[PDB]
Design an enzyme around this catalytic site. Structure first.
Site, PDB file in Angstrom:
ATOM      1  N   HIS A 117      13.135  57.756  17.846  1.00  0.00           N
ATOM      2  CA  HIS A 117      13.980  57.836  16.665  1.00  0.00           C
ATOM      3  C   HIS A 117      13.951  56.482  16.013  1.00  0.00           C
ATOM      4  O   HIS A 117      13.708  55.481  16.676  1.00  0.00           O
ATOM      5  CB  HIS A 117      15.443  58.159  17.016  1.00  0.00           C
ATOM      6  CG  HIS A 117      15.639  59.645  17.259  1.00  0.00           C
ATOM      7  ND1 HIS A 117      15.246  60.652  16.465  1.00  0.00           N
ATOM      8  CD2 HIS A 117      16.197  60.203  18.402  1.00  0.00           C
ATOM      9  CE1 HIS A 117      15.522  61.789  17.080  1.00  0.00           C
ATOM     10  NE2 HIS A 117      16.099  61.506  18.241  1.00  0.00           N
ATOM     11  N   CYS A 120      11.824  57.867  12.589  1.00  0.00           N
ATOM     12  CA  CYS A 120      12.293  58.227  11.248  1.00  0.00           C
ATOM     13  C   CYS A 120      12.642  56.996  10.485  1.00  0.00           C
ATOM     14  O   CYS A 120      12.810  55.964  11.122  1.00  0.00           O
ATOM     15  CB  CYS A 120      13.541  59.069  11.306  1.00  0.00           C
ATOM     16  SG  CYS A 120      13.047  60.732  11.622  1.00  0.00           S
TER      17      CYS A 120
END
Lengths: 4, 167, 88, 88, 167, 4
Positions: free
Chosen positions: B107, B155
């Site tokens: 992430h 991300c």
């Protein structure tokens, strides 16, 4: 689909 | 290898074409090429990145195919990640390498990549250029003048990336 | 003797999304960027330097496949073409 | 109908120094980067796309000319070669 | 032009070689190409960038040579710079352009480029991606799918950029 | 030479  | 091989003439054309503006490749007999994959799939608060295994299997096998020995480290923390990087900066094998590849998969948010203990309220962020800083000529003289390719799957915020247009 | 060296040089970073935006991952298949990056490396590692392979991965993202992302290449300080040389 | 477009794409930025570092300017001559960039554009705008011209400016900075800087290329989202086409 | 001209066969080879992966060039008869130079030489507190004129004369003449009409704006402020950019985003000519070039020349620090009123204690900084944000597909639909080349001469801090090594 |  998944976001990351 | 599963990578499409350069026949010897092809390579030769490329050195004969651009020899002054190409990174030199060390001899296959002896170079010691290192790559590093860090991948966080299980996190402490935020949901597990199902699918990551495929990514690790994909990239491990590729780099290896491309000529690298691959360290894989998983589920680390910005700090663990940093420490790994500083150790990576110090591997003797770099001295006999001609490039390196680091791959981060996690992430991420706009400040950088997330370590495993990341929460919305305490951040475990590895800053985009902590990574640079740690492999620069000061911190990693061994890779002076060698390509360092950094690859990052993470991300970069929440926005979907699209705007509407018409016709 | 001591000479001066540039503190950073010969770097390149390749990110999955452009800033502020998500990137896409799938359970049974992994992340779109990594897969596409592998496909392109397998096919092009021979004939193209690493910067042109990266471009070709960005071009594979030019029509929004429904889920959109556009990988970005960053902090390039590569001073020379980097040809991987598979099988060499 | 409405279609989706990528919010950023087709950008490239070219900076004089690598982050944290100075870049060099001269009274009677202007800034080393801008001059070198012009020289390279004049010579190469024909045969090279804009990304390879930029690389060649970085390579002109590879030996530290005493005063060192290393221009950096950033946020590339150029999906295709950009050939300027002088005289066209 | 003082730029080395592509003879017609040369161009033809380049379109015939890569036609699918090249930005299309609009017709010389009709395209309206814009470029923008913002240059701060006189500052309010920090010392004047002697030499900038040469840079402006150099780049104005080049872009023009390359096919652009050049706005030059000088000695602005992060805000003036922003406003200019938003106006630049809105020029009708972009609709009939195929690329653009923006050039910024100023002192800069690590947060970004300095506007004229910059002091150590009140910052007049234009953030590196204010510039991106202002020309993206949302804010500048006119340049959707066209190359936007941003060029920046500015310092990025105080460090000299070198590390010592031996032999 | 001056820095910028």
């Amino acid at each position: 689909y998944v976001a990351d | 290898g599963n990578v499409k091989l350069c026949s010897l003439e092809e390579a030769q054309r490329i050195w004969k074409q651009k020899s002054a503006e190409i990174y030199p490749i060390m001899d296959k007999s002896s170079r010691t090429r290192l790559a590093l994959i860090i991948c966080n799939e299980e996190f402490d608060s935020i949901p597990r990145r199902t699918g990551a295994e495929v990514d690790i299997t994909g990239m491990t096998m590729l780099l290896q195919n491309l000529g690298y020995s691959v360290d894989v480290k998983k589920n680390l923390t910005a700090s663990d990640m940093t420490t790994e990087l500083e150790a990576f900066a110090h591997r003797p094998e770099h001295k006999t390498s001609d490039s390196t590849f680091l791959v981060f998969m996690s992430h991420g948010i706009r400040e950088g990549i997330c370590g495993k203990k990341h929460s919305e309220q305490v951040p475990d962020i590895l800053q985009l250029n902590a990574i640079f800083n740690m492999l620069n000529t000061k911190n990693c003289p061994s890779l002076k003048d060698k390509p360092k390719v950094i690859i990052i799957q993470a991300c970069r915020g929440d926005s979907p990336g699209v705007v509407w247009f018409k016709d | 003797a001591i000479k001066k060296a540039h503190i950073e040089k010969d770097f390149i970073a390749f990110c999955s999304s452009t800033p502020d935006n998500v990137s896409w991952r799938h359970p049974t298949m992994g992340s779109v960027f990594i897969g596409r990056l592998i496909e392109h490396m397998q096919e092009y590692a021979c004939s193209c330097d690493v910067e042109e392979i990266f471009r070709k991965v960005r071009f594979s993202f030019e029509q929004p496949d429904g889920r959109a992302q556009m990988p970005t290449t960053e902090r390039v300080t590569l001073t020379r073409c980097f040809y991987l040389f598979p099988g060499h």
